[PDB]
């Protein structure tokens, strides 16, 4: 009754707070906590840190920490424990390069038990927001380091948070229980079991049969036709949040034929997005015309949408010398046929469905899209090295969008950097991204974001598809299920069946 059963496609992993795969972010967030906490309105609030001051030049920050916090094993949380955690993370700095704060921190030291000083290389504006992320800046008991480090593994995953990992049974389940010695508000739920169920249909069936009480995830959570059916069945409860992030294609500006602006523009008129959403996504998501929705901070720029218009797509291609040979449906220019490879994870049935629609839509305007469905590692490797023509991609949701997503466009080993490599203005874009992150002149900040997002839009780097929502399926006795402000987190501690 105060225990619930739910599911996840894989086990939660070791729960090393400072590493990535195979750690599941939502679970790191259940056990480990930030100095300051992200809120829906976009601010952060005091959390493990009660308060903070900063120097006039914005580069030195001093946090006053709470003095009543214990790790779940009884050991104290204090400035020394915090400082040791920052050291452990930064001893592995190279792996955090995607996150600009990790390049910004020049020093962290405990000034006393309750005072923590962080020194930055520049007045990095998103400082607090990045401290608030699920990883890597959260705190494990230093006693649980291995040889004074965490980058080579941890002992027990001892955090300060409201949940404690009880046991993990590989490929079967993970059990968490409530921290009875939590510094903050006590969760009403005392135990959460995560059944390992990798297949979306099997998750749907597990819920139907009563095996599980709750499903909480993005558009991939369960089949969307089944989701629609569940929402009409009074025996169940379902929810669909307001949109959290964008799903789009990235187009390779550095590889023929997507290296041509005219081709990228034509592709952006070719897809009937509303129909795609109604056909493949059962009408559960929203059409996206821009990289970021207009509701995203800094992103309400009045950018012009490219509406579904096959006639205009064709005219663009013809004008660019992509014409149809006699007897053929696929355009050619300088001998070369208009062929584009679309990469996606092959076992992902939803990605595959959208890919087929996109392929069909583009064929109607004379573009031959070849589907390349591959395993994750192969797709990720393609993203890193630019071996794609078009690839499925998505933004990261709050609090990453837009600043952290944009920041990462500068990093060579990522899809967006690769996709943008063919732009003459790529260096300028990357310089402006660097500038905007350290800008405290609010006017200049908005102008830089406008210029960056406008160039990306006008250069047709992306083919935005939809703004997607979080969805929930639950037994009615659990009541309304809240959403966590951070899109990768799951607010189990706010679930209150009574």
């Amino acid at each position: 009754p105060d225990e619930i059963t739910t599911a996840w496609p894989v086990n939660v992993g070791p729960l090393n707070p400072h590493l990535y795969t195979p750690n599941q972010m939502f679970a790191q967030s259940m056990v480990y906590e930030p100095l300051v906490k992200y809120q829906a309105d976009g601010s952060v609030i005091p959390w493990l840190a009660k308060s903070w001051t900063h120097s006039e030049d914005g580069k030195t920050w001093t946090f006053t920490l709470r003095d009543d916090v214990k790790f779940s094993n009884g050991e104290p949380f204090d400035a020394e424990a915090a400082a040791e955690n920052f050291r452990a993370v930064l001893d592995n700095r190279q792996r955090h390069a995607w996150l600009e704060l990790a390049n910004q921190i020049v020093d962290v030291k405990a000034l006393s038990k309750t005072e923590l000083q962080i020194t930055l290389k520049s007045a990095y504006y998103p400082f607090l927001q990045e401290l608030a992320l699920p990883r890597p800046f959260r705190f494990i008991a230093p006693s649980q380091f291995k040889n004074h480090e965490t980058m080579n593994g941890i002992k027990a995953p001892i955090g300060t948070g409201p949940w404690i990992l009880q046991e993990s049974k590989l490929n079967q389940y993970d059990v968490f229980v409530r921290n009875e010695n939590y510094w903050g508000e006590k969760p009403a739920i005392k135990k959460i079991t995560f059944n390992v169920i990798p297949d979306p249909t099997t998750r749907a069936v597990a819920f139907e049969t009563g095996d599980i009480d709750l499903l909480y995830g993005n558009e991939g959570l369960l089949p969307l036709d089944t989701f629609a059916r569940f929402s009409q069945n009074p025996a169940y409860h379902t929810q669909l949040s307001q949109p959290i992030e964008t799903v789009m294609l990235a187009l390779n500006t550095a590889k023929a034929p997507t290296n041509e602006l005219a081709v990228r523009e034509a592709l952006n008129y070719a897809v009937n997005k509303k129909s795609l959403i109604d056909n493949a996504l059962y009408g559960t998501q929203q059409v996206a015309d821009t990289l970021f929705a207009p509701s995203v901070p800094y992103a309400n720029l009045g950018l012009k949408p490219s509406q579904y218009d096959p006639q205009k797509a064709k005219a663009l291609l013809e004008k660019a010398g992509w014409t149809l040979p006699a007897g053929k449906d696929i355009r050619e220019k300088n001998g070369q046929p208009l062929r584009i490879e679309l990469s996606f994870i092959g076992t992902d049935a939803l990605s595959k469905s959208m890919a087929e629609i996109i392929q069909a839509d583009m064929r109607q305007i004379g573009a031959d899209v070849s589907l390349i469905g591959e395993e994750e590692s192969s797709i990720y490797a393609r993203q890193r090295d630019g071996r794609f023509g078009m690839i499925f991609h998505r933004t990261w949701g709050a609090p990453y969008d837009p600043h952290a997503f944009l920041s990462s466009m500068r990093v060579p080993s990522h899809a967006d950097f690769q996709a943008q490599q063919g732009l003459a203005d790529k260096p300028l874009i990357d310089k402006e991204i660097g500038e905007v992150l350290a800008t405290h002149d609010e006017t200049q900040r908005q102008a830089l974001y406008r210029d960056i997002l406008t160039r990306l839009h006008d250069e047709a780097v992306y083919l935005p598809i939809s703004y997607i929502s979080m969805m929930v399926v639950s037994k009615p006795e659990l009541g309304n299920i809240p959403y966590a402000p951070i899109a990768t987190e799951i607010p189990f501690e706010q679930i209150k069946p009574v």
Side-chain angles (χ1 to χ4, degrees), residues 287-490:
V287 170
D289 306 296
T290 48
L291 173 63
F292 295 106
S295 57
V296 172
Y298 307 106
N300 195 67
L301 303 167
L303 299 170
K304 180 183 190 179
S306 290
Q307 306 288 18
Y308 172 61
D309 194 340
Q311 182 173 76
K312 189 174 304 180
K314 293 185 205 173
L316 287 171
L317 294 170
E318 294 272 339
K319 182 172 179 185
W322 289 96
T323 72
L324 293 160
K328 285 174 153 299
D329 293 335
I330 303 304
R331 290 163 191 285
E332 300 188 3
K333 174 183 185 174
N334 302 334
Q336 309 291 331
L338 182 62
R339 175 196 148 110
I340 308 160
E341 300 189 347
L342 176 53
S343 287
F344 58 95
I345 299 173
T347 49
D348 180 343
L350 186 53
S351 286
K352 179 173 169 47
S353 182
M354 294 175 66
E356 290 281 5
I357 286 169
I358 290 156
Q359 178 185 50
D361 287 356
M362 288 175 183
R363 191 165 183 99
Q364 285 292 312
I365 53 96
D368 181 19
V369 175
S370 279
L371 300 186
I372 312 286
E374 296 177 339
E375 58 194 300
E376 282 201 8
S377 166
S378 299
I379 299 301
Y380 294 142
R382 283 183 183 271
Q383 293 197 358
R384 289 194 311 270
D385 65 0
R387 288 179 303 102
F388 58 86
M390 302 190 308
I391 197 157
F392 278 89
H393 197 16
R394 62 198 301 133
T395 67
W396 297 342
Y400 302 91
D401 292 352
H403 89 273
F405 193 79
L406 255 46
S407 178
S408 77
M409 296 170 167
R410 295 175 298 165
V411 179
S413 72
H414 295 194
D416 301 277
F417 175 92
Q418 294 292 339
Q420 298 172 16
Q421 274 317 105
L423 297 173
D425 289 337
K426 174 54 165 162
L428 169 62
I429 286 163
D430 284 357
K431 178 181 166 170
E432 288 183 345
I433 291 168
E435 180 175 351
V436 80
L437 298 169
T439 302
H440 292 263
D441 176 333
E442 298 287 358
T443 299
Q444 181 63 354
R445 187 187 298 177
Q446 290 169 20
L448 287 162
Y449 278 135
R450 171 181 303 274
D451 186 66
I452 295 161
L453 293 177
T454 299
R455 297 182 180 269
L456 294 181
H457 188 74
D458 287 347
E459 290 284 6
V461 178
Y462 303 96
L463 207 171
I465 294 162
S466 60
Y467 300 124
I468 62 91
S469 292
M470 211 68 184
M471 43 199 5
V472 177
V473 180
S474 58
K475 290 184 183 184
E477 63 200 81
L478 299 188
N480 179 67
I481 309 297
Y483 303 111
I486 298 182
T488 52
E489 297 191 342
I490 304 178

Side-chain angles (χ1 to χ4, degrees), residues 37 163 185 187-189 480-483 491-497:
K37 187 185 189 176
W163 306 105
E185 310 298 324
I189 288 163
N480 179 67
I481 309 297
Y483 303 111
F492 292 107
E493 59 292 317
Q494 302 267 280
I495 297 172
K496 193 190 189 73

Side-chain angles (χ1 to χ4, degrees), residues 15-18 27-37 46-49 65-83 85 131 133-134 137-145 154 156-165 176-187 493:
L15 308 187
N16 186 327
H18 305 152
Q28 288 163 301
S29 285
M30 287 169 64
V31 168
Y32 304 106
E33 300 190 293
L35 295 178
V36 302
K37 187 185 189 176
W47 203 247
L48 297 179
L65 305 183
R66 303 188 58 98
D67 70 354
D68 61 343
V69 176
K70 309 286 190 278
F71 291 98
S72 63
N73 67 356
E75 296 172 346
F77 173 75
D78 54 20
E80 157 136 77
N85 271 262
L131 285 182
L133 297 177
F137 302 113
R138 297 193 183 196
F139 306 93
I140 184 173
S143 63
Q144 302 310 296
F145 290 11
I154 50 142
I158 299 306
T160 63
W163 306 105
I164 306 173
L165 180 59
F176 290 81
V177 301
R178 185 174 63 198
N179 182 3
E180 301 296 345
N181 307 108
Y182 180 53
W183 64 274
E185 310 298 324
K186 181 155 297 213
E493 59 292 317

Side-chain angles (χ1 to χ4, degrees), residues 97-118:
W98 67 273
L99 180 66
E100 182 56 21
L101 179 53
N103 303 309
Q104 289 292 320
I105 293 173
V106 293
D107 189 75
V108 178
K109 60 157 64 76
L111 310 177
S112 71
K113 283 299 173 62
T114 53
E115 300 278 306
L116 177 68
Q117 190 188 77
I118 298 174

Side-chain angles (χ1 to χ4, degrees), residues 235-247:
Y236 309 142
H237 178 60
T238 73
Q239 311 179 180
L240 183 72
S241 75
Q242 297 186 315
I244 63 173
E245 66 214 12
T246 314
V247 168

Side-chain angles (χ1 to χ4, degrees), residues 251-260 264 385-386 388-389 417-423:
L251 309 185
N252 195 333
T253 64
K255 180 183 311 299
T258 43
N259 68 301
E260 292 177 37
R264 297 196 305 276
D385 65 0
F388 58 86
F417 175 92
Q418 294 292 339
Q420 298 172 16
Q421 274 317 105
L423 297 173

